[PDB]
Amino acid sequence: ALHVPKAPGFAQMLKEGAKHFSGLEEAVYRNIQACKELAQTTRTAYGPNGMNKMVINHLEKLFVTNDAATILRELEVQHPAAKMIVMASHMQEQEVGDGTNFVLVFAGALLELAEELLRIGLSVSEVIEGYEIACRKAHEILPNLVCCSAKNLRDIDEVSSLLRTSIMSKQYGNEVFLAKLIAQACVSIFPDSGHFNVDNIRVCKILGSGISSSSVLHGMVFKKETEGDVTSVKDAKIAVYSCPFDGMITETKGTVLIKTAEELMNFSKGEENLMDAQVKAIADTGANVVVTGGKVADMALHYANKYNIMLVRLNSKWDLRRLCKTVGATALPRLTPPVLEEMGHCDSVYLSEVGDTQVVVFKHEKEDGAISTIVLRGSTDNLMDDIERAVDDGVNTFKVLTRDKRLVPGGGATEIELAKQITSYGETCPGLEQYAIKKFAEAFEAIPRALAENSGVKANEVISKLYAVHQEGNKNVGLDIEAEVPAVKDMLEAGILDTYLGKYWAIKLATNAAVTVLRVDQIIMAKPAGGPK
């Protein structure tokens, strides 16, 4: 009577390192606790008053940021339920670009309230049905909460005002300047055709002069140098070649079979003459810049230097394609001289040094082009990385605005209005699902609560004020960040607006993740074993 044996049946047949969890307390409550812990970890980095987190991954690489998706991806989350919530957040990041923290906070709140509902007596099926009903109601209500629309995307001022809110949460101190930069970069891109490509905006990070010295260049910047002696062209005539700048060779195997003395003596002379003829034929088309994706032969380099031809070597094919897009050239596969339609043009190409790094600049005089680049300065690599993440968020916001032009008030106004309307609807609904609907409505309060907590005020007073103000009917009212006392203000005048599509997708994904986590009843984990990656 000193040991409790394993129960006969499945308990004995289990493997050595395996783990089995079944029932409410062992599985569902524990999953809810894990998801709540994940939400707690990410909570403090929400809103303009969010705090950056120094995260160091297994490779001893330092990340400091407040982007929820980056923080989650830099943490090796082990619990499968939190893994699922992270997958939902990453899916939201991929689909929209902003709102990962909203997804995570909403999922955590929903799961916590689901745990409370299960404790007070409801069933999992009832809770899931209630959340699905409430999510459908919220998606119905959301279009009616739209306050204004973009109504113009070729303008600089309007696009800057629209993009300020997205990049105010990250880099709160200085958002106007970054908004102006990203607005200019996006307006240069996005031609009369309605299609907008996010990848057409490039970011170059050059260290040294503080982020306020960043600028926008209509073209591209490569952290390389020029192989040849020429380092400046004023009427660029780029002739892109995807082949190495050398005489082509046989693909199977080539051996120089010499049978007489004269052939041996004349081989090198003939080869050099052929190289010179090819390079002169290239130069006779007026081309003065040559960009090659392969190696550069010594004799080819010499003959190019003889004819005053700039040489730029691009190691990556993606850079070659981007340069072709931004210049207007075609990546030739042979050393044949380029024809006029394949002839690349640019306003200016030169070699310049920024800070202490030599760069090659392909600059367009016009405020237009296929590809635009943002030269980012700063005093730290991590700071420039954060500025790049903010730039990505702003560009994704611009893309979403291109897809859908509707906007809803931010700063917890939309969440409070949604909670109020869903609570009002839940009263009219009889049956047991009304509790789940009301908890779904209450879960929206975690957004204004997080904003108030991060801003340093009492969340309860802010929430009560928001409910009162929305009770009279001002549905565009959220908390005021620039105040040391709990206060609210109208977001429409303040211009604090977030994309409707982002809210829609974030709510959908958070609800789906919470419901899918709730559906799980048993967990059969296997021995972790190895898995180096």
């Binding site: 050595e16 074993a529 190895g530 180096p532």
Partner: protein, 212 residues
Amino acid sequence: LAGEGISVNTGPKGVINDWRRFKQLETEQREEQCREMERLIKKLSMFLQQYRKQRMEEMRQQLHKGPQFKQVFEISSGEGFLDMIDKEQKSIVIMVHIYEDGIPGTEAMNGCMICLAAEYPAVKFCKVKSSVIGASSQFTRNALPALLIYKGGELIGNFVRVTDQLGDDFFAVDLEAFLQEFGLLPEKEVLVLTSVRNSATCHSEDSDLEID
């Protein structure tokens, strides 16, 4: 303390037998110490894509056919390992398995070697515990499952943590393909089922000779 230029005369000469007595023992010990050192420490410090033929190779790998199915050679002495690797013809490959009883990832390996021995009679599959060899504490604790391979008296196989690239459910087909990827398994030969045996001995033939 002076006269350090001793230039000793016969002391070491007079004790030459006693000196060789333990010098030979130390040489014998460092024989296996150097043989093992070549394994320890250095690696201890750290729809054709779906194998259509894997299944069918599994079924006709169940072709024991002959008498019983035998078992891998078990080595219970380090000197036994040393004087079996030192001896024997170096033309054919010698494969050694290191294991400790109880630890997972062993029985599957032994079954794979058992199945492969029938496929390749030339190979000399054998297994030995890490305890008798004299493996280090780290190698014993978390480096036991390893396929030591020797050919020509020198290492040809440098495999430890075979479960990392094989898991724990790997079959003989998986191990055979993995080894053939590196070109270490000797190529198969055509074989037929003899009645049982023909030959008895080889000596002066004295065959038939019709003479007047």
